[PDB]
Amino acid sequence: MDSDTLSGLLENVAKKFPDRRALSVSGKFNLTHARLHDLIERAASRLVSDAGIKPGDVVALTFPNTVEFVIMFLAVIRARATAAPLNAAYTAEEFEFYLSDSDSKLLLTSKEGNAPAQEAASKLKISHVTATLLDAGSDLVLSVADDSATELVNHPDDGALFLHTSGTTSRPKGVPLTQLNLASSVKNIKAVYKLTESDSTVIVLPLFHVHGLLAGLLSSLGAGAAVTLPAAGRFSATTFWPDMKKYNATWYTAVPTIHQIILDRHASHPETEYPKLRFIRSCSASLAPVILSRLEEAFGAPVLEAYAMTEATHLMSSNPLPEEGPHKPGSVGKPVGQEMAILNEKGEIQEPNNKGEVCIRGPNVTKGYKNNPEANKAGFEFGWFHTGDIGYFDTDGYLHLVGRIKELINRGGEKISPIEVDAVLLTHPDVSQGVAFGVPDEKYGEEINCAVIPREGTTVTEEDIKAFCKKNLAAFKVPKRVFITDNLPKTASGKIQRRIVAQHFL
Numbered sequence: 001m002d003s004d005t006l007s008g009l010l011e012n013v014a015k016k017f018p019d020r021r022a023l024s025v026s027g028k029f030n031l032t033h034a035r036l037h038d039l040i041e042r043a044a045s046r047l048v049s050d051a052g053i054k055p056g057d058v059v060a061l062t063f064p065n066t067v068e069f070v071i072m073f074l075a076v077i078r079a080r081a082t083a084a085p086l087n088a089a090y091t092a093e094e095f096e097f098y099l100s101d102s103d104s105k106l107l108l109t110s111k112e113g114n115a116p117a118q119e120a121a122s123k124l125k126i127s128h129v130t131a132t133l134l135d136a137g138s139d140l141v142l143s144v145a146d147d148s149a150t151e152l153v154n155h156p157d158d159g160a161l162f163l164h165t166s167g168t169t170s171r172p173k174g175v176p177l178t179q180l181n182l183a184s185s186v187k188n189i190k191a192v193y194k195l196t197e198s199d200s201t202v203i204v205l206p207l208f209h210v211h212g213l214l215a216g217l218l219s220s221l222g223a224g225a226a227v228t229l230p231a232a233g234r235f236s237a238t239t240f241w242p243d244m245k246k247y248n249a250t251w252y253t254a255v256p257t258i259h260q261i262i263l264d265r266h267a268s269h270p271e272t273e274y275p276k277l278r279f280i281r282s283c284s285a286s287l288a289p290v291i292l293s294r295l296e297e298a299f300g301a302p303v304l305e306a307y308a309m310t311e312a313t314h315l316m317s318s319n320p321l322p323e324e325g326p327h328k329p330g331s332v333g334k335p336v337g338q339e340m341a342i343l344n345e346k347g348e349i350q351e352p353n354n355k356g357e358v359c360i361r362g363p364n365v366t367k368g369y370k371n372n373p374e375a376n377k378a379g380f381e382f383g384w385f386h387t388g389d390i391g392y393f394d395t396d397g398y399l400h401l402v403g404r405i406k407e408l409i410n411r412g413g414e415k416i417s418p419i420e421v422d423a424v425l426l427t428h429p430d431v432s433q434g435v436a437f438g439v440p441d442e443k444y445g446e447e448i449n450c451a452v453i454p455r456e457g458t459t460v461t462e463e464d465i466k467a468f469c470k471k472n473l474a475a476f477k478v479p480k481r482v483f484i485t486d487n488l489p490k491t492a493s494g495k496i497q498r499r500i501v502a503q504h505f506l
């Protein structure tokens with residue numbers, strides 16, 4: 001059943017599991033694998049014959065998390081074109097930038113449209129086409145005027161997905177990913193979680209970032225499993241568990257800020273009963289051990305943390321299923337389907353429990369950034385990609401992350417991990433959210449500060465937080481200032497970015 005292209009893999013899946021459920025929209029649609037496969041083939045045929053899409057063309061997509069986004073994403077790639085999913089919330093100026101930078105030749109949206117994206121596409125003279133799924137008796141309707149897919153051969157080295165990085169420690173970089181990149185990551189994710197055709201999940205993350213796209217959507221479809229999209233095209237804490245129950249979910253994946261919202265909802269409105277999940281997954285930012293504990297206690301499933309990035313087509317490492325090995329709080333587990341090494345600044349491989357930069361090598365990894373010869377010369381050596389993250393392997397081969405090189409706090413020669421300190425802040429009884437960050441300091445060069453959101457109806461002082469930290473951290477790691485606030489900025493992906501927080505409180 002496996003294949004070295006995503007389109008090939010999905011074809012094998014449809015043939016093996018044609019009448020199993022593939023894709024539901026809560027309360028509305030329920031597509032089987034054969035039906036979805038044919039909707040995709042027919043749409044790809046229309047893109048080639050009627051929209052003039054040629055191999056290597058880039059097609060931009062901007063949708064909520066909807067059935068048309070799924071169908072058109074896979075139709076674009078099937079037609080040997082490259083999909084460039086874009087955040088629907090961008091301004092017209094942002095859209096103009098990303099449409100130009102990706103070399104998009106076509107913009108797809110829903111029939112309702114997206115006014116800023118349409119404004120940008122018109123200014124750049126890029127065609128705009130809408131996509132609508134009506135009923136089970138009809139093909140997907142495309143707004144382009146009136147077979148041709150069948151002939152098409154998908155090559156592992158064809159471009160398939162073009163994304164930018166989240167912009168956390170830099171200006172977002174452009175990342176081209178191939179059919180082969182996608183197929184490799186789908187095989188890795190399916191393998192480490194043993195996804196099979198009886199699995200089922202609800203998507204709670206944006207499908208324009210690789211976490212929800214690769215793990216939630218594509219790896220499920222690649223196992224013959226099922227995916228449910230929320231009725232309103234985005235995560236809702238109120239409909240999450242009803243959807244998970246109704247559509248027989250067996251797992252879900254989310255980022256720590258979304259897991260915290262789900263936990264809050266469990267505290268204020270517990271369900272009378274929860275489904276028994278095989279596992280709950282967390283990725284994209286560190287999962288504090290206390291959040292892991294809270295999730296296992298609330299929902300009774302093992303919580304497996306993974307480590308991933310856009311340049312790796314998502315998954316690099318994960319804690320294993322309990323039947324294969326332990327999962328370690330504070331750890332992102334073992335490499336899956338790729339090589340990984342910890343290197344010092346001279347490129348020497350480090351022994352266990354010695355820190356260094358995490359480097360990876362594998363068929364899931366991008367061949368290189370688009371139009372950035374310098375980032376490529378800096379980031380790649382003999383096939384290995386330098387992640388920019390500092391970590392170490394313990395003697396079981398489990399990876400422990402210390403943090404991004406650019407985020408470590410250098411206080412008078414001692415480096416502080418903001419990950420470590422965050423994990424402590426979240427254990428304070430009255431802290432609902434917390435983030436540590438570096439700031440300039442005239443005596444030590446850099447100092448650590450933090451910001452916390454108190455739990456509703458509690459009052460928290462800087463001095464309480466600091467005292468609590470002093471009981472749980474070496475003194476040099478204790479935030480010198482604690483900012484108390486009602487809200488922290490997070491990305492569309494759900495990451496709190498420390499540089500933004502820092503600037504905001506200074």
Ligand SMILES: Nc1ncnc2c1ncn2[C@@H]1O[C@H](COP(=O)(O)OP(=O)(O)OP(=O)(O)O)[C@@H](O)[C@H]1O
Pocket residue numbers: 165166167168169170171172173282283284285286287305306307308309310311332387389401403404493495
């Ligand atoms: N489980 C985890 N724990 C800690 N950090 C993680 C984890 N999973 C992913 N990360 C972090 O997320 C990064 C990947 O994020 P993504 O590819 O979305 O872009 P970004 O690094 O946030 O943005 P930019 O590349 O523009 O700086 C990893 O390099 C690592 O720093």
Ligand SMILES: [Mg+2]
Pocket residue numbers: 165166168309388
């Ligand atoms: Mg990055």
